[PDB]
Amino acid sequence: MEELEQGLLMQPWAWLQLAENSLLAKVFITKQGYALLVSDLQQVWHEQVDTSVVSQRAKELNKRLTAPPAAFLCH
Amino acid sequence: ESEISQEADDMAMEKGKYVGELRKALLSGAGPADVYTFNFSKESCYFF
């Protein structure tokens, strides 16, 4: 995992939207997983995810869908 | 009728759109972008 956080530290912030709502974010994806950090300029939110969590959550979100987690992370 | 519905509805896609995928898969309606792969045990007789 640690390489994801260490990539995350060197990520720029970027801008994102939806429908009058908007976030600042940075992500560092690899084949291992991702680290994500998010802010609405009022609170800050974090996740890190590994290969296991990718497989389990992609399946529970898209049951029939049978790639290895690398395809899900690369998409 | 209900088996195609349930197959689509578990994947959460509009039936008719999922039927699109079925036509393309099963009736050679594939474009060059579409790559479909076909699997069968004769032993179990399970197609997918």
Side-chain angles (χ1 to χ4, degrees):
Chain A
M1 264 303 115
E2 296 97 313
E3 202 280 310
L4 308 211
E5 182 51 32
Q6 192 47 87
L8 200 71
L9 284 164
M10 296 315 139
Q11 299 306 76
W13 290 94
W15 196 79
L16 200 60
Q17 55 186 348
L18 298 159
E20 207 58 39
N21 295 330
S22 51
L23 291 171
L24 296 203
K26 57 168 58 183
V27 76
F28 186 99
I29 326 274
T30 70
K31 82 112 303 179
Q32 292 95 35
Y34 66 74
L36 176 65
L37 195 72
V38 151
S39 175
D40 72 344
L41 309 147
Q42 299 284 246
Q43 298 163 72
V44 183
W45 294 269
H46 179 267
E47 176 174 46
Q48 67 185 31
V49 155
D50 59 316
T51 294
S52 168
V53 169
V54 177
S55 300
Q56 181 39 56
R57 192 188 314 170
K59 284 303 215 171
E60 80 206 17
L61 294 186
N62 323 255
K63 286 281 189 170
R64 299 307 194 197
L65 294 202
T66 317
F72 303 144
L73 287 158
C74 170
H75 172 70
Chain B
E1 306 178 36
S2 58
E3 286 172 305
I4 291 150
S5 289
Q6 197 73 5
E7 199 76 300
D9 286 339
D10 190 30
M11 285 184 279
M13 165 171 283
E14 160 59 340
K15 207 183 180 205
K17 191 181 176 185
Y18 177 77
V19 175
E21 283 295 350
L22 275 174
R23 321 226 65 145
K24 295 152 201 179
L26 304 187
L27 313 185
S28 326
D34 305 306
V35 182
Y36 300 105
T37 294
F38 308 110
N39 306 267
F40 190 61
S41 175
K42 302 71 54 76
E43 317 87 74
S44 84
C45 274
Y46 190 81
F47 193 90
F48 67 96

